[PDB]
Amino acid sequence: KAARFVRTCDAFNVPVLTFVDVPGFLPGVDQEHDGIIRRGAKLIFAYAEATVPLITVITRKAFGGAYIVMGSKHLGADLNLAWPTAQIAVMGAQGAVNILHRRTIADAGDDAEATRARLIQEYEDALLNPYTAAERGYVDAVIMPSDTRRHIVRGLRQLRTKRESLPPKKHGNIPL
Amino acid sequence: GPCAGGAVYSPAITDFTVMVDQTSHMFITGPDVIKTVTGEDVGFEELGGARTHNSTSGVAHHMAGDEKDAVEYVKQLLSYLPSNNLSEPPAFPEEADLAVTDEDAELDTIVPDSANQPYDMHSVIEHVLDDAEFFETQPLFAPNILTGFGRVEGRPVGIVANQPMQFAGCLDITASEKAARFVRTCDAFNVPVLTFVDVPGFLPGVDQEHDGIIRRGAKLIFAYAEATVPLITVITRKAFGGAYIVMGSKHLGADLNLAWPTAQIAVMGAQGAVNILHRRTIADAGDDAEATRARLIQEYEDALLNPYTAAERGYVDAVIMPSDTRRHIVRGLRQLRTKRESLPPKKHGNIPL
Amino acid sequence: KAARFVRTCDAFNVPVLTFVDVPGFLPGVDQEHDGIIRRGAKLIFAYAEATVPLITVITRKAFGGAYIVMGSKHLGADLNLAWPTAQIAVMGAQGAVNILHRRTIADAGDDAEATRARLIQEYEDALLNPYTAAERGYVDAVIMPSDTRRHIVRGLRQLRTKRESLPPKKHGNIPL
Amino acid sequence: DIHTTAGKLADLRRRIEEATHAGSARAVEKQHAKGKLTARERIDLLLDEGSFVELDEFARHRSTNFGLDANRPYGDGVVTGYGTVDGRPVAVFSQDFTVFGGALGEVYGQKIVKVMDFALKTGCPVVGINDSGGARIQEGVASLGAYGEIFRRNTHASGVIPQISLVV
C-alpha cells in the first residue's frame, strides 16, 4: 500500500511526511508463505529510491526491521525526528532479555522472574527511548511533541530545493 | 545459512537469490514468535526452508543439492549478464548453421493435432538455443511459465514462455510476477528477451481476483512495454484476449513477432465466443439447437482461430514454419542487437506493486 | 516561400497557424523541368520537422499531395480543424470519375455525358466533404466557421507546452 | 487435412505460394517484357544471397470502397523486409507494379512504415525501390494519409539513416 504511494509521490516531486509507531511485522506462516519478504522490501525500495524531501517523525514504537522501513535516515531520509515517547530499539525488551540473558537467567530458579521481569524493566528504562539512536545521529533530534509542525514547516522550507539522483539506469528492479 | 528478520530484505532487493536444501533459511519472524501470536505450528524448513521459498513465496530462484551446486550455479548466472548496465552481456560469438538441421525439423511435428494435448515447451526452446543448453530459473515456482537464459550464436538471451505441461500454460498471479520481474532484469542489463507463447487465458478463481490479480497481472505487461532490449516473440499455438496482449505482443513494442500455423490468435475462445455472437441465431430453431451451436463453433475456429487474421493487420510480421524458428531468431537478433529505443524522461516509472 | 517561413517560425518557437484551401499543384512543363519535385518537397519537410504548436484549419479545398503538404496531421500537426465547407479528398470529382468509372460509363455513348454528370454529383455529394477524414481521425474536428478563433485560442493554450524532438542528428538533409 | 498439425503446415506452404505470386501470370510477363524485373527480383539482386527476411508477407487490406475487397492479394502490393548488403544490415521495401498498378494503399503504406520504423530504430539504411503507379484512388484520403506518415518518417530520419530511392 505505502510503497506504491511513496513512489507515486516521488515521481511527481511531492514531499513525503512519515509518522512512525510500528512494533514489527505481523507474525504468521501466511505472511512468509505469501512472500512478505519480496513484498515488504518494496517499502524500503520506495524510500531508498525517493529523492523528494523526506521528513520522518517517530511518535512511539520503532523496533528492528520495521524501524528501518519507516523512512529511516538509513534510507536517505533528510530529517528524522522523534518524540520523547518514542522507543528506538533493535527489539522489544521482553524478547531482548530472553536472548542476552540466558545463562544469567537460568541461575537461581528461585525468583526466575523477579530477576527477569526486573531485568526487563532495566532495558525498557535504558534502551527503549530515542536517546540511544539520537546519541549517534540516527535521529536528527528529539523534540517536544508540540513542535512537530514548527519542525515540519521550517524544515520543508529548506528541503524544497533538494537535489538528489540515483545512479543512471534504464529503470530499477524493485521486488515484484 | 540463516537469514532472519529485516536482513531477509537485502536478498529481496538483489537480483537472483540462490538457496540450498535445509542448509539455509529465510524468514522475517521466527517460528516461535509466530505461535505465541497466532498459535500456528510450523518448523523452520516448512516456514522458510529452501523448498518453501522456491515454490511458495517466489523469493528464491534456485534450489541446489549442496553448496557446491549452488556456487556453480551463480557462476553460470554471471556468465549470461554483463559486469554492469553500461555494457552488453559477455559473448563468445560463433556463426550458426543457416540451414535447417534435422533438429529444426523436429518442431514441425512437436505440436499435436489435439487442441487439448500438451507438449513440453522446453523442447521448443532447446531447439533455438545454442547446444540446446537452457539455464532455467525458478523452475519450481509458477511452473505454468518458464523463465531463464541461453545463448544464440554465443550471445546471452533471456527466455520467457508458457508451459502447457503445467496448468495448461495459464496466466495467473504467481506467473505474472515470476516473468515480469525476470523481464525487467533482462532489460536492465541489456539481455534480449525471446518469448514463446501458448496461453488460453487467465486462471479463473475468486481467490485470484481477491488476491489482486488486476494489479499483479499488469506487472507482466508493464515489464514488457517498459523493456527496450531486443524483443522477439514466437506464438506457437494459444493466443487469447489479454493473455495474447500480455505475452510480448507487437502492441507492447516487440520487434519481431513470429507465429506458427499451429497458432490461434483471437479475442476469445471459439467455444465461448459464439455464445455471444450468435446468442440470437442460436435461440431460433431450437430444432437441433446444439447442432447449430456446434456447427458455428466449427466455422469459427476454422475461420478465426488461426494467425492469418492478425497476420493481415500486421500484428505478426510473419507466419513461419516451426522448423524455421531458430533460423529466424538467429538472423533476427543480428539486426535487433543495435536497437536504440528509450522511454520518456522520469525519476522512475510507477509499476503496480 | 512557405517552407523557409515555417522553418523560421519553428527555429524561434513561434506556433504556426495554417489555413488551407488548395486544389493541387500548378500544372506546367516548365514547373517539372524546374524542380517542383524537390523544391516543393521543402514545404512538407518544413512541416514534418516542425516541433511547435501546429493548428491547421481547412476552409475549403484539400486535394491529393496538396492536402498532405499543407500542415496535415500526417506530418505532425497538433490540431487539424475543418469547416463544413471542406473538400478532403484524394482528387477532384471531375477527374476521379474518369478513372474510377471508365467501363461503367463507356456503355451508351449517348446518355453518357449525363451518366458522368450524375456520377460526378453522386461522388462529390458523398466524398468531397471533410467527414471522411473525420472518421479516421485525420482531422480533430469539423467546426463552425464561427468557432475558428475560439478554437485556435483555447487550443494554443494547451499546445503552448508541447515538447517534441526529432532523432538526434548533426542536422537534417532537406532538399535544395 | 486442415484440422491437423500437418495440414495447418501444408496450408502455409500453399499460402507462401500464391503470396510470392500475388500479381497475375500476365502482369509478370508484361513486366519482364518491358525489361523491368519483378519486385521480388529487385530485392534478391540487391540483398546478400539468402539474407532476405520478409515482413508483412501475408498482410491484406480492408477497403470495401468500390468493391476492392474482391481482390485482396497477400502483401497488398509491396514486398517489405530486411536483409544484408555486402555484409551490412539494410531494410528495404519493393513496390510491386504487378499488383493494382503498384498504387499506394492503406496496408501498402503501413508496411513501408513498419520498415522505416525498424530501419531507424536499428540504425540501418532504407533502400526504397519504387514503381508506384499512383495513389489507390478507391481508398480516397486513406491513401493520402499513408503517403504522409511516410513523408514524416523521411524527414525525421533525414540525416539519421542513409535513405536511397530506386526509381525503376
mmCIF file with all atom_site columns, C-alpha atoms in Angstrom, chain B residues 16-183:
data_model
loop_
_atom_site.group_PDB
_atom_site.id
_atom_site.type_symbol
_atom_site.label_atom_id
_atom_site.label_alt_id
_atom_site.label_comp_id
_atom_site.label_asym_id
_atom_site.label_entity_id
_atom_site.label_seq_id
_atom_site.pdbx_PDB_ins_code
_atom_site.Cartn_x
_atom_site.Cartn_y
_atom_site.Cartn_z
_atom_site.occupancy
_atom_site.B_iso_or_equiv
_atom_site.pdbx_formal_charge
_atom_site.auth_seq_id
_atom_site.auth_comp_id
_atom_site.auth_asym_id
_atom_site.auth_atom_id
_atom_site.pdbx_PDB_model_num
ATOM 1   C CA . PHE B 1 16  ? 18.833 -13.599 -8.130  1.00 0.00 ? 16  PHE B CA 1
ATOM 2   C CA . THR B 1 17  ? 18.766 -15.371 -4.770  1.00 0.00 ? 17  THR B CA 1
ATOM 3   C CA . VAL B 1 18  ? 20.158 -18.965 -4.583  1.00 0.00 ? 18  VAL B CA 1
ATOM 4   C CA . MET B 1 19  ? 19.269 -21.428 -1.786  1.00 0.00 ? 19  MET B CA 1
ATOM 5   C CA . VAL B 1 20  ? 20.319 -24.883 -0.597  1.00 0.00 ? 20  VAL B CA 1
ATOM 6   C CA . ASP B 1 21  ? 18.146 -27.743 0.714   1.00 0.00 ? 21  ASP B CA 1
ATOM 7   C CA . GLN B 1 22  ? 17.732 -27.345 4.509   1.00 0.00 ? 22  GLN B CA 1
ATOM 8   C CA . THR B 1 23  ? 21.246 -25.699 4.720   1.00 0.00 ? 23  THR B CA 1
ATOM 9   C CA . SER B 1 24  ? 19.755 -22.196 4.692   1.00 0.00 ? 24  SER B CA 1
ATOM 10  C CA . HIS B 1 25  ? 16.544 -20.441 5.807   1.00 0.00 ? 25  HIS B CA 1
ATOM 11  C CA . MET B 1 26  ? 14.818 -17.082 5.239   1.00 0.00 ? 26  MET B CA 1
ATOM 12  C CA . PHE B 1 27  ? 12.149 -15.502 7.445   1.00 0.00 ? 27  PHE B CA 1
ATOM 13  C CA . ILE B 1 28  ? 11.134 -12.137 8.991   1.00 0.00 ? 28  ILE B CA 1
ATOM 14  C CA . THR B 1 29  ? 9.507  -13.531 12.153  1.00 0.00 ? 29  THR B CA 1
ATOM 15  C CA . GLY B 1 30  ? 10.887 -16.613 13.921  1.00 0.00 ? 30  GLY B CA 1
ATOM 16  C CA . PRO B 1 31  ? 8.775  -19.833 14.010  1.00 0.00 ? 31  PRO B CA 1
ATOM 17  C CA . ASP B 1 32  ? 8.446  -19.394 17.773  1.00 0.00 ? 32  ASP B CA 1
ATOM 18  C CA . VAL B 1 33  ? 7.202  -15.792 17.847  1.00 0.00 ? 33  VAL B CA 1
ATOM 19  C CA . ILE B 1 34  ? 4.594  -16.962 15.286  1.00 0.00 ? 34  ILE B CA 1
ATOM 20  C CA . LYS B 1 35  ? 2.976  -19.446 17.704  1.00 0.00 ? 35  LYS B CA 1
ATOM 21  C CA . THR B 1 36  ? 2.975  -17.080 20.677  1.00 0.00 ? 36  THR B CA 1
ATOM 22  C CA . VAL B 1 37  ? 0.951  -14.671 18.459  1.00 0.00 ? 37  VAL B CA 1
ATOM 23  C CA . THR B 1 38  ? -1.349 -16.779 16.268  1.00 0.00 ? 38  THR B CA 1
ATOM 24  C CA . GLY B 1 39  ? -0.897 -20.324 17.530  1.00 0.00 ? 39  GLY B CA 1
ATOM 25  C CA . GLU B 1 40  ? 0.278  -21.672 14.186  1.00 0.00 ? 40  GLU B CA 1
ATOM 26  C CA . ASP B 1 41  ? 2.674  -24.631 14.392  1.00 0.00 ? 41  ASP B CA 1
ATOM 27  C CA . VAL B 1 42  ? 5.433  -24.833 11.766  1.00 0.00 ? 42  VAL B CA 1
ATOM 28  C CA . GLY B 1 43  ? 9.048  -25.986 11.606  1.00 0.00 ? 43  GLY B CA 1
ATOM 29  C CA . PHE B 1 44  ? 11.921 -23.930 10.180  1.00 0.00 ? 44  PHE B CA 1
ATOM 30  C CA . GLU B 1 45  ? 12.256 -25.947 6.962   1.00 0.00 ? 45  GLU B CA 1
ATOM 31  C CA . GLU B 1 46  ? 8.481  -25.539 6.471   1.00 0.00 ? 46  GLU B CA 1
ATOM 32  C CA . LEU B 1 47  ? 8.262  -21.833 7.354   1.00 0.00 ? 47  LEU B CA 1
ATOM 33  C CA . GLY B 1 48  ? 11.263 -20.523 5.421   1.00 0.00 ? 48  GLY B CA 1
ATOM 34  C CA . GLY B 1 49  ? 13.140 -23.554 4.105   1.00 0.00 ? 49  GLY B CA 1
ATOM 35  C CA . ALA B 1 50  ? 14.676 -23.644 0.621   1.00 0.00 ? 50  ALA B CA 1
ATOM 36  C CA . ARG B 1 51  ? 11.917 -25.820 -0.819  1.00 0.00 ? 51  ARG B CA 1
ATOM 37  C CA . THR B 1 52  ? 9.311  -23.434 0.617   1.00 0.00 ? 52  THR B CA 1
ATOM 38  C CA . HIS B 1 53  ? 10.626 -20.220 -0.955  1.00 0.00 ? 53  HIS B CA 1
ATOM 39  C CA . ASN B 1 54  ? 11.488 -21.987 -4.199  1.00 0.00 ? 54  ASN B CA 1
ATOM 40  C CA . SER B 1 55  ? 7.828  -22.762 -4.836  1.00 0.00 ? 55  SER B CA 1
ATOM 41  C CA . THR B 1 56  ? 5.510  -20.943 -2.395  1.00 0.00 ? 56  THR B CA 1
ATOM 42  C CA . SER B 1 57  ? 6.795  -17.398 -1.741  1.00 0.00 ? 57  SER B CA 1
ATOM 43  C CA . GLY B 1 58  ? 8.629  -16.733 -5.007  1.00 0.00 ? 58  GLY B CA 1
ATOM 44  C CA . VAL B 1 59  ? 11.558 -15.171 -3.153  1.00 0.00 ? 59  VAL B CA 1
ATOM 45  C CA . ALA B 1 60  ? 14.078 -17.810 -4.159  1.00 0.00 ? 60  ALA B CA 1
ATOM 46  C CA . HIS B 1 61  ? 15.380 -18.503 -7.670  1.00 0.00 ? 61  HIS B CA 1
ATOM 47  C CA . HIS B 1 62  ? 17.167 -21.842 -7.299  1.00 0.00 ? 62  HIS B CA 1
ATOM 48  C CA . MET B 1 63  ? 17.325 -24.851 -5.008  1.00 0.00 ? 63  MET B CA 1
ATOM 49  C CA . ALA B 1 64  ? 20.626 -26.743 -5.182  1.00 0.00 ? 64  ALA B CA 1
ATOM 50  C CA . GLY B 1 65  ? 21.561 -30.111 -3.680  1.00 0.00 ? 65  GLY B CA 1
ATOM 51  C CA . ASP B 1 66  ? 24.571 -28.778 -1.836  1.00 0.00 ? 66  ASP B CA 1
ATOM 52  C CA . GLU B 1 67  ? 26.655 -25.650 -1.534  1.00 0.00 ? 67  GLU B CA 1
ATOM 53  C CA . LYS B 1 68  ? 28.798 -26.837 -4.454  1.00 0.00 ? 68  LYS B CA 1
ATOM 54  C CA . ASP B 1 69  ? 25.898 -26.962 -6.921  1.00 0.00 ? 69  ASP B CA 1
ATOM 55  C CA . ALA B 1 70  ? 24.960 -23.502 -5.729  1.00 0.00 ? 70  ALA B CA 1
ATOM 56  C CA . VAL B 1 71  ? 28.339 -21.855 -6.285  1.00 0.00 ? 71  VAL B CA 1
ATOM 57  C CA . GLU B 1 72  ? 28.478 -23.421 -9.709  1.00 0.00 ? 72  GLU B CA 1
ATOM 58  C CA . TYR B 1 73  ? 25.011 -22.002 -10.300 1.00 0.00 ? 73  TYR B CA 1
ATOM 59  C CA . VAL B 1 74  ? 25.748 -18.340 -9.573  1.00 0.00 ? 74  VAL B CA 1
ATOM 60  C CA . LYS B 1 75  ? 28.811 -18.686 -11.797 1.00 0.00 ? 75  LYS B CA 1
ATOM 61  C CA . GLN B 1 76  ? 26.594 -19.717 -14.723 1.00 0.00 ? 76  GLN B CA 1
ATOM 62  C CA . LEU B 1 77  ? 24.201 -16.933 -13.820 1.00 0.00 ? 77  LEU B CA 1
ATOM 63  C CA . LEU B 1 78  ? 27.023 -14.466 -14.032 1.00 0.00 ? 78  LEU B CA 1
ATOM 64  C CA . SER B 1 79  ? 28.089 -15.802 -17.411 1.00 0.00 ? 79  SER B CA 1
ATOM 65  C CA . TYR B 1 80  ? 24.840 -14.518 -19.003 1.00 0.00 ? 80  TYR B CA 1
ATOM 66  C CA . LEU B 1 81  ? 24.951 -10.975 -17.627 1.00 0.00 ? 81  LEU B CA 1
ATOM 67  C CA . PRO B 1 82  ? 27.287 -8.053  -18.097 1.00 0.00 ? 82  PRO B CA 1
ATOM 68  C CA . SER B 1 83  ? 29.521 -6.770  -15.261 1.00 0.00 ? 83  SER B CA 1
ATOM 69  C CA . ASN B 1 84  ? 27.268 -3.665  -15.207 1.00 0.00 ? 84  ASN B CA 1
ATOM 70  C CA . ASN B 1 85  ? 24.466 -1.987  -17.133 1.00 0.00 ? 85  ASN B CA 1
ATOM 71  C CA . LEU B 1 86  ? 26.819 0.247   -19.144 1.00 0.00 ? 86  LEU B CA 1
ATOM 72  C CA . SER B 1 87  ? 27.606 -2.779  -21.301 1.00 0.00 ? 87  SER B CA 1
ATOM 73  C CA . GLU B 1 88  ? 26.135 -5.679  -23.258 1.00 0.00 ? 88  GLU B CA 1
ATOM 74  C CA . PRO B 1 89  ? 26.384 -9.149  -21.677 1.00 0.00 ? 89  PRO B CA 1
ATOM 75  C CA . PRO B 1 90  ? 29.666 -11.022 -22.439 1.00 0.00 ? 90  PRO B CA 1
ATOM 76  C CA . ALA B 1 91  ? 29.848 -13.061 -25.642 1.00 0.00 ? 91  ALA B CA 1
ATOM 77  C CA . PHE B 1 92  ? 31.580 -15.955 -27.347 1.00 0.00 ? 92  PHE B CA 1
ATOM 78  C CA . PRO B 1 93  ? 30.426 -15.336 -30.945 1.00 0.00 ? 93  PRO B CA 1
ATOM 79  C CA . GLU B 1 94  ? 30.269 -18.359 -33.273 1.00 0.00 ? 94  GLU B CA 1
ATOM 80  C CA . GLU B 1 95  ? 28.378 -18.394 -36.587 1.00 0.00 ? 95  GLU B CA 1
ATOM 81  C CA . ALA B 1 96  ? 25.267 -20.525 -36.652 1.00 0.00 ? 96  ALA B CA 1
ATOM 82  C CA . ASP B 1 97  ? 24.002 -23.028 -39.184 1.00 0.00 ? 97  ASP B CA 1
ATOM 83  C CA . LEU B 1 98  ? 21.785 -21.078 -41.542 1.00 0.00 ? 98  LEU B CA 1
ATOM 84  C CA . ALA B 1 99  ? 20.389 -24.302 -42.996 1.00 0.00 ? 99  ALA B CA 1
ATOM 85  C CA . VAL B 1 100 ? 17.678 -26.472 -41.484 1.00 0.00 ? 100 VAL B CA 1
ATOM 86  C CA . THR B 1 101 ? 19.131 -29.018 -39.141 1.00 0.00 ? 101 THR B CA 1
ATOM 87  C CA . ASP B 1 102 ? 17.446 -32.343 -38.516 1.00 0.00 ? 102 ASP B CA 1
ATOM 88  C CA . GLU B 1 103 ? 16.695 -30.929 -35.053 1.00 0.00 ? 103 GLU B CA 1
ATOM 89  C CA . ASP B 1 104 ? 14.824 -27.956 -36.533 1.00 0.00 ? 104 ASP B CA 1
ATOM 90  C CA . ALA B 1 105 ? 12.526 -30.264 -38.473 1.00 0.00 ? 105 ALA B CA 1
ATOM 91  C CA . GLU B 1 106 ? 11.543 -31.988 -35.218 1.00 0.00 ? 106 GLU B CA 1
ATOM 92  C CA . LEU B 1 107 ? 9.486  -28.927 -34.424 1.00 0.00 ? 107 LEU B CA 1
ATOM 93  C CA . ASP B 1 108 ? 7.325  -29.360 -37.496 1.00 0.00 ? 108 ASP B CA 1
ATOM 94  C CA . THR B 1 109 ? 5.581  -32.068 -35.545 1.00 0.00 ? 109 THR B CA 1
ATOM 95  C CA . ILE B 1 110 ? 6.113  -31.048 -31.908 1.00 0.00 ? 110 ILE B CA 1
ATOM 96  C CA . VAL B 1 111 ? 2.566  -29.602 -31.674 1.00 0.00 ? 111 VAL B CA 1
ATOM 97  C CA . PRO B 1 112 ? -0.122 -32.321 -31.591 1.00 0.00 ? 112 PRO B CA 1
ATOM 98  C CA . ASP B 1 113 ? -3.303 -32.077 -33.711 1.00 0.00 ? 113 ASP B CA 1
ATOM 99  C CA . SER B 1 114 ? -5.325 -32.137 -30.487 1.00 0.00 ? 114 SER B CA 1
ATOM 100 C CA . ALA B 1 115 ? -6.062 -28.643 -29.204 1.00 0.00 ? 115 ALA B CA 1
ATOM 101 C CA . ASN B 1 116 ? -6.124 -30.313 -25.769 1.00 0.00 ? 116 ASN B CA 1
ATOM 102 C CA . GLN B 1 117 ? -2.938 -32.337 -25.878 1.00 0.00 ? 117 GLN B CA 1
ATOM 103 C CA . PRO B 1 118 ? 0.109  -30.656 -24.164 1.00 0.00 ? 118 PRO B CA 1
ATOM 104 C CA . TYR B 1 119 ? 3.702  -30.618 -25.365 1.00 0.00 ? 119 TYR B CA 1
ATOM 105 C CA . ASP B 1 120 ? 6.785  -29.689 -23.417 1.00 0.00 ? 120 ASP B CA 1
ATOM 106 C CA . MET B 1 121 ? 7.821  -26.067 -24.132 1.00 0.00 ? 121 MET B CA 1
ATOM 107 C CA . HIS B 1 122 ? 11.383 -26.718 -23.011 1.00 0.00 ? 122 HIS B CA 1
ATOM 108 C CA . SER B 1 123 ? 11.673 -28.714 -26.209 1.00 0.00 ? 123 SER B CA 1
ATOM 109 C CA . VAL B 1 124 ? 10.694 -25.665 -28.210 1.00 0.00 ? 124 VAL B CA 1
ATOM 110 C CA . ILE B 1 125 ? 13.324 -23.530 -26.506 1.00 0.00 ? 125 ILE B CA 1
ATOM 111 C CA . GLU B 1 126 ? 16.116 -26.099 -26.610 1.00 0.00 ? 126 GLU B CA 1
ATOM 112 C CA . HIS B 1 127 ? 15.751 -26.080 -30.358 1.00 0.00 ? 127 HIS B CA 1
ATOM 113 C CA . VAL B 1 128 ? 16.611 -22.391 -30.780 1.00 0.00 ? 128 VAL B CA 1
ATOM 114 C CA . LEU B 1 129 ? 19.350 -22.048 -28.098 1.00 0.00 ? 129 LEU B CA 1
ATOM 115 C CA . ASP B 1 130 ? 22.997 -22.982 -28.727 1.00 0.00 ? 130 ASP B CA 1
ATOM 116 C CA . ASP B 1 131 ? 23.901 -26.501 -27.657 1.00 0.00 ? 131 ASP B CA 1
ATOM 117 C CA . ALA B 1 132 ? 20.244 -26.849 -26.675 1.00 0.00 ? 132 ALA B CA 1
ATOM 118 C CA . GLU B 1 133 ? 21.551 -25.555 -23.357 1.00 0.00 ? 133 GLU B CA 1
ATOM 119 C CA . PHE B 1 134 ? 18.750 -23.938 -21.359 1.00 0.00 ? 134 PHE B CA 1
ATOM 120 C CA . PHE B 1 135 ? 19.619 -22.413 -17.984 1.00 0.00 ? 135 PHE B CA 1
ATOM 121 C CA . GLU B 1 136 ? 16.318 -22.227 -16.099 1.00 0.00 ? 136 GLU B CA 1
ATOM 122 C CA . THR B 1 137 ? 15.440 -20.023 -13.101 1.00 0.00 ? 137 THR B CA 1
ATOM 123 C CA . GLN B 1 138 ? 12.674 -20.625 -10.503 1.00 0.00 ? 138 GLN B CA 1
ATOM 124 C CA . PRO B 1 139 ? 11.769 -23.991 -12.032 1.00 0.00 ? 139 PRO B CA 1
ATOM 125 C CA . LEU B 1 140 ? 9.597  -24.934 -9.049  1.00 0.00 ? 140 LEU B CA 1
ATOM 126 C CA . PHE B 1 141 ? 7.715  -21.633 -8.735  1.00 0.00 ? 141 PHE B CA 1
ATOM 127 C CA . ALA B 1 142 ? 4.925  -20.776 -11.168 1.00 0.00 ? 142 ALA B CA 1
ATOM 128 C CA . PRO B 1 143 ? 5.590  -23.874 -13.303 1.00 0.00 ? 143 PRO B CA 1
ATOM 129 C CA . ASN B 1 144 ? 2.975  -22.644 -15.711 1.00 0.00 ? 144 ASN B CA 1
ATOM 130 C CA . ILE B 1 145 ? 5.646  -20.418 -17.159 1.00 0.00 ? 145 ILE B CA 1
ATOM 131 C CA . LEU B 1 146 ? 9.335  -20.780 -17.843 1.00 0.00 ? 146 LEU B CA 1
ATOM 132 C CA . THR B 1 147 ? 11.961 -18.063 -17.389 1.00 0.00 ? 147 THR B CA 1
ATOM 133 C CA . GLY B 1 148 ? 15.669 -18.453 -17.937 1.00 0.00 ? 148 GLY B CA 1
ATOM 134 C CA . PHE B 1 149 ? 18.698 -17.770 -20.133 1.00 0.00 ? 149 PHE B CA 1
ATOM 135 C CA . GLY B 1 150 ? 20.676 -19.295 -23.006 1.00 0.00 ? 150 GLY B CA 1
ATOM 136 C CA . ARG B 1 151 ? 22.805 -18.343 -25.951 1.00 0.00 ? 151 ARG B CA 1
ATOM 137 C CA . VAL B 1 152 ? 22.109 -17.692 -29.616 1.00 0.00 ? 152 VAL B CA 1
ATOM 138 C CA . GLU B 1 153 ? 25.233 -17.519 -31.730 1.00 0.00 ? 153 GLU B CA 1
ATOM 139 C CA . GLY B 1 154 ? 27.158 -17.178 -28.470 1.00 0.00 ? 154 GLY B CA 1
ATOM 140 C CA . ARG B 1 155 ? 25.303 -14.106 -27.228 1.00 0.00 ? 155 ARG B CA 1
ATOM 141 C CA . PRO B 1 156 ? 23.274 -14.416 -23.985 1.00 0.00 ? 156 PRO B CA 1
ATOM 142 C CA . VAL B 1 157 ? 19.494 -14.135 -24.239 1.00 0.00 ? 157 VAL B CA 1
ATOM 143 C CA . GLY B 1 158 ? 16.535 -14.370 -21.902 1.00 0.00 ? 158 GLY B CA 1
ATOM 144 C CA . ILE B 1 159 ? 13.601 -16.697 -22.224 1.00 0.00 ? 159 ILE B CA 1
ATOM 145 C CA . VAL B 1 160 ? 10.004 -16.419 -21.116 1.00 0.00 ? 160 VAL B CA 1
ATOM 146 C CA . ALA B 1 161 ? 7.402  -18.950 -22.269 1.00 0.00 ? 161 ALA B CA 1
ATOM 147 C CA . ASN B 1 162 ? 4.190  -20.704 -21.288 1.00 0.00 ? 162 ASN B CA 1
ATOM 148 C CA . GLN B 1 163 ? 4.408  -24.365 -20.200 1.00 0.00 ? 163 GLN B CA 1
ATOM 149 C CA . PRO B 1 164 ? 1.355  -26.231 -21.499 1.00 0.00 ? 164 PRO B CA 1
ATOM 150 C CA . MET B 1 165 ? 2.549  -29.156 -19.354 1.00 0.00 ? 165 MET B CA 1
ATOM 151 C CA . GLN B 1 166 ? 1.570  -27.205 -16.272 1.00 0.00 ? 166 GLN B CA 1
ATOM 152 C CA . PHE B 1 167 ? -1.938 -25.940 -15.676 1.00 0.00 ? 167 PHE B CA 1
ATOM 153 C CA . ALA B 1 168 ? -2.279 -25.593 -19.448 1.00 0.00 ? 168 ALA B CA 1
ATOM 154 C CA . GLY B 1 169 ? 0.201  -22.726 -19.543 1.00 0.00 ? 169 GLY B CA 1
ATOM 155 C CA . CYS B 1 170 ? -2.246 -20.327 -17.946 1.00 0.00 ? 170 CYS B CA 1
ATOM 156 C CA . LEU B 1 171 ? -1.507 -16.883 -16.664 1.00 0.00 ? 171 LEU B CA 1
ATOM 157 C CA . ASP B 1 172 ? -2.067 -16.196 -13.012 1.00 0.00 ? 172 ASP B CA 1
ATOM 158 C CA . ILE B 1 173 ? -0.707 -14.203 -10.089 1.00 0.00 ? 173 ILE B CA 1
ATOM 159 C CA . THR B 1 174 ? 2.403  -16.260 -9.403  1.00 0.00 ? 174 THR B CA 1
ATOM 160 C CA . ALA B 1 175 ? 3.157  -16.460 -13.170 1.00 0.00 ? 175 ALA B CA 1
ATOM 161 C CA . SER B 1 176 ? 2.811  -12.765 -13.929 1.00 0.00 ? 176 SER B CA 1
ATOM 162 C CA . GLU B 1 177 ? 5.136  -11.897 -11.054 1.00 0.00 ? 177 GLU B CA 1
ATOM 163 C CA . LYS B 1 178 ? 7.668  -14.563 -11.936 1.00 0.00 ? 178 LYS B CA 1
ATOM 164 C CA . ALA B 1 179 ? 8.086  -13.422 -15.579 1.00 0.00 ? 179 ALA B CA 1
ATOM 165 C CA . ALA B 1 180 ? 7.626  -9.698  -15.053 1.00 0.00 ? 180 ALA B CA 1
ATOM 166 C CA . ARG B 1 181 ? 10.461 -9.382  -12.592 1.00 0.00 ? 181 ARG B CA 1
ATOM 167 C CA . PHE B 1 182 ? 12.581 -11.554 -14.860 1.00 0.00 ? 182 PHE B CA 1
ATOM 168 C CA . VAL B 1 183 ? 11.890 -9.468  -17.951 1.00 0.00 ? 183 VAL B CA 1
#
